[PDB]
Amino acid sequence: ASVHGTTYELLRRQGIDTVFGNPGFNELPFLKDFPEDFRYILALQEACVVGIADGYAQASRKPAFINLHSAAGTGNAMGALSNARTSHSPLIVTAGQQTRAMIGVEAGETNVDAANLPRPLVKWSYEPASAAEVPHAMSRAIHMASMAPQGPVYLSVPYDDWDKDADPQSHHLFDRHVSSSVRLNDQDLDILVKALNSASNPAIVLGPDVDAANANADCVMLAERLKAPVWVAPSAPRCPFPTRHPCFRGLMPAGIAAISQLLEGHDVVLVIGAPVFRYYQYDPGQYLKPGTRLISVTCDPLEAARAPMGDAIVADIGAMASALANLVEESSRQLPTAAPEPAKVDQDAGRLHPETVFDTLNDMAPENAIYLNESTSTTAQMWQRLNMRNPGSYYFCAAGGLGFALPAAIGVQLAEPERQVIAVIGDGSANYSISALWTAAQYNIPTIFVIMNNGTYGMLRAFAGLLEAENVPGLDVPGIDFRALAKGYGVQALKADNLEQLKGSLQEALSAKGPVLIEVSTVSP
Ligand SMILES: Cc1ncc(C[n+]2csc(CCOP(=O)(O)OP(=O)(O)O)c2C)c(N)n1
Ligand SMILES: [Mg+2]
């Protein structure tokens, strides 16, 4: 009968059993009487709350539910919501509002013009006009988050609403099923399949929505049937393909001219689940060389509209990948040759080269490990050196916003308790969401954090070189003791100053029953 009771019934009926949150005054009437079939995951700062929720939703491929405090709690999470937008993460962000009777006077903790604060990062944002409509607004939020293209949504709820009577008609919300598992009509799909079958030198480019859809295995069958090389689209937030499969060609360069040069000679380039393209450095040139046609399958109208070249189909990635994989003819061409083994770099018995750490991780980690990357200057080496053969094995801040991997690795590990999660994070990136470590300690979530400590924002110094930007301040972060910080939050703390210490401490961390942070001294660039 109460809005509180009806809303938790709607959540449980829609598959939700976990609330990620940091509490406040406005949220106490929502969180009180907390149901025994739900669990509450506390984090100490809201960027950490949302990052944990985000990794959990991406790994579990289902929506995550979040409860923050009013404007200041929502505002603390806006960086994390920037990443969630670009990863298409289905996050239901709720926040408590002041009692309806004092919103106009703007009492303390009032979220002023609340629906505008999340924008423009969310796909829907709303504050209900009455308590009895809160379950309906929750239902809208749940489905807006889950419908393709998935993404974060925001709901602001005045705290006096929870005790009020819910609309009796709200029960019709509980079991609603909304599908967007759609694909191109048969006639046009046959034209596309005919164009793929008849390409003499096709190429495939895969983006994060493939891994989100668990379309990986169908994309493998597609690449094998067309005998086609496979790249992952630049600035990759996820891994959509086994990285040691013979077709895999790794991470594309993030420049306009670099990409059209690599494409040159491929007559049909099929892009699935990816923006066209997430360029980074400005590398002006031709978008495509003559003789290359590009076709993009995307779950997101905005991606289809913003591409500067190619044709596009707006459809569900799982349904389209499955349909294409089963319809294309087996080409008589020879399968592409696997990329060469990465080489061992020179390693003396002191500070570690990043290449060495990736090679050791690849040797020792389980074959179904899950990795997260926030070591920004070593991303290329990481993609070359980690054999990720299974789906959901890689996460990287989708919008480039640091502060994702440390909390996200906790959420992934929570969602996949049978797969060892290993977050490789630079010493600069580690600080943005450092307090997330406490959640791993308190809930005994056994994520492994590998801190790559070279004392500087290495990626920025390299980019500065690219931009001929000299005498830039703020690029060095000396004087951080990551073992002490780990201890501060109750997380076991190891160090690795050479290769033998690295091997030993990783093997310890694998066997450890709790979370473990390993501080690795890496070479300064
Ligand atoms: C929230 C946020 N603030 C700042 C940046 C800019 N940024 C991009 S890479 C980087 C350096 C990260 O340093 P570290 O994690 O130590 O790795 P390294 O580059 O040395 O491998 C910074 C500050 C960003 N992307 N996001
Ligand atoms: Mg660094």
DSSP string for 388-452: --SSS-EEE-TT--TTSHHHHHHHHHHH-TTS-EEEEEETTGGGTTGGGHHHHHHTT---EEEEE
Query: Of 434, 433, 441, nearest to 413 (Cα)?
Result: 441
Which atom of ligand 1 is the closest one to the Cα of 458?
Answer: 20
For residue 453, the CA-to-ligand 2 centroid distance in Å is: 6
User: 265 and 146 in one domain?
Assistant: no
Q: Is the CB of 202 under 6 A from ligand 1?
A: no
Query: Which residue's entry shows tokens 């983006």?
Result: 207
Residue type, 26: N
For residue 375, the CA-to-ligand 2 centroid distance in Å is: 7
Which atom of ligand 1 is the closest one to the Cα of 462?
Answer: 19
Answer yes or no: are the C-beta atoms of 425 and 406 closer than 8 Å.
yes
User: 299 and 194 in one domain?
Assistant: yes
User: 139 and 10 in one domain?
Assistant: yes
Q: Is the CB of 455 under 6 A from ligand 1?
A: no
User: 190 and 168 in one domain?
Assistant: no
270 annotated ligand binder: no
Which atom of ligand 1 is the closest one to the Cα of 426?
Answer: 15
Question: Closest residue (by CA) to atom 4 of ligand 1?
Answer: 402
Residue type, 196: L
249 annotated ligand binder: no
Best residue for ligand 1 mutational test, from 278, 402, 477 (most atoms within 8 Å of Cβ): 402
If you ran DSSP here, which 8-state letter would residue 364 be given? H
Q: What is the resolution of this structure in A?
A: 1.9
User: 251 and 358 in one domain?
Assistant: no
Query: Which residue's entry shows tokens 């066997």?
Result: 511
Geometric angle at alpha carbon 505, from 501 and 507, rounded to 5°: 120
DSSP string for 488-523: HTT-EEEEESSHHHHHHHHHHHHH-SS-EEEEEEB-
Report yes or no on 456 lying in a domain. Answer: yes
Best residue for ligand 1 mutational test, from 373, 434, 456, 457 (most atoms within 8 Å of Cβ): 457
For residue 59, the CA-to-ligand 2 centroid distance in Å is: 27
For residue 506, the CA-to-ligand 2 centroid distance in Å is: 20
User: 402 and 379 in one domain?
Assistant: yes
Report yes or no on 104 lying in a domain. Answer: yes
Strand ordering across the sheet containing 293-298: 248-251, 230-232, 203-206, 268-272, 293-298, 311-314
Report yes or no on 340 lying in a domain. Answer: no
Q: Is the CB of 260 under 6 A from ligand 1?
A: no
For residue 43, the CA-to-ligand 2 centroid distance in Å is: 25
Half-sphere exposure (Cβ direction) of 36: Cα atoms closer than 13 Å: 0
CA distance 270 to 327: 15
User: 515 and 367 in one domain?
Assistant: yes
Residue 455 belongs to a domain with what CATH number?
3.40.50.970
Query: Which residue's entry shows tokens 């949220």?
Result: 27
CA distance 394 to 417: 16
User: 147 and 218 in one domain?
Assistant: no
For residue 302, the CA-to-ligand 1 centroid distance in Å is: 27
The sign one gets for the Cα dihedral 124, 129, 131, 135 is negative
For residue 493, the CA-to-ligand 2 centroid distance in Å is: 19
For residue 521, the CA-to-ligand 1 centroid distance in Å is: 18
- Neighbouring CB atoms inside 10 A of 405's CB total 30
**308-314 LR contacts (CB < 8 Å, sep 24+):** 308/276, 309/276, 310/269, 310/271, 310/276, 312/276, 313/184, 313/188, 313/192
Do strands 293-298 and 311-314 pair parallel, antiparallel, or not at all (unpaired)?
parallel
User: 272 and 394 in one domain?
Assistant: no
Report yes or no on 180 lying in a domain. Answer: no
Q: Is the CB of 492 under 6 A from ligand 1?
A: no
Answer yes or no: are the C-beta atoms of 109 and 26 closer than 8 Å.
yes
User: 296 and 265 in one domain?
Assistant: yes
Report yes or no on 488 lying in a domain. Answer: yes
Strand ordering across the sheet containing 492-496: 394-396, 370-374, 421-426, 448-453, 516-521, 492-496
Last residue of a domain, one of 150, 173, 196: 173
For residue 476, the CA-to-ligand 2 centroid distance in Å is: 8
Q: Is the CB of 413 under 6 A from ligand 1?
A: no
Report yes or no on 345 lying in a domain. Answer: no
Best residue for ligand 1 mutational test, from 81, 375, 378, 429 (most atoms within 8 Å of Cβ): 429
Q: For residue 408, what are the domain limits? A: 354-521
Which atom of ligand 1 is the closest one to the Cα of 429?
Answer: 15
Do strands 421-426 and 492-496 pair parallel, antiparallel, or not at all (unpaired)?
unpaired
For residue 420, the CA-to-ligand 1 centroid distance in Å is: 25
Element (H, E) at 313: strand 311-314
Residue 196 belongs to a domain with what CATH number?
3.40.50.1220
Report yes or no on 493 lying in a domain. Answer: yes
User: 265 and 314 in one domain?
Assistant: yes
Compute φ and ψ for 131, nearest 5 degrees.
-65, -40
Beta bridge partners of 199: none
Which atom of ligand 1 is the closest one to the Cα of 354?
Answer: 21
Q: Is the CB of 456 under 6 A from ligand 1?
A: yes
Last residue of a domain, one of 149, 173, 197: 173
Which atom of ligand 1 is the closest one to the Cα of 378?
Answer: 21
390 annotated ligand binder: no
Q: Is the CB of 235 under 6 A from ligand 1?
A: no
Report yes or no on 179 lying in a domain. Answer: no
User: 190 and 167 in one domain?
Assistant: no
Compute φ and ψ for 409, nearest 5 degrees.
-60, -30
Query: Of 447, 480, 477, nearest to 372 (Cα)?
Result: 447
Q: Is the CB of 357 under 6 A from ligand 1?
A: no
Method of elucidation: X-ray
If you ran DSSP here, which 8-state letter would residue 309 be given? S
Last residue of a domain, one of 120, 142, 173: 173
End-to-end CA distance of the chain: 62
Query: Which residue's entry shows tokens 């300064």?
Result: 524
119 annotated ligand binder: yes
Strand ordering across the sheet containing 125-126: 39-42, 18-21, 64-69, 91-97, 153-158, 125-126
Helix (H, G, I), strand (E, B) or coil at 297: strand
Domain count, the chain: 3
- Quote the tokens at residue 78: 């806006």
Compute φ and ψ for 267, nearest 5 degrees.
-85, -30
Element (H, E) at 19: strand 18-21
CA–chain centroid gap for 314, Å, is: 21
If you ran DSSP here, which 8-state letter would residue 214 be given? T
Q: Give residues with Cβ within 8 angstroms of 56, minimum separation 6.
A: 18, 20, 64, 411, 412, 414, 415
Q: Of the bound ligands, which one is closest to the alpha carbon of residue 474?
A: 1
CA distance 422 to 405: 10
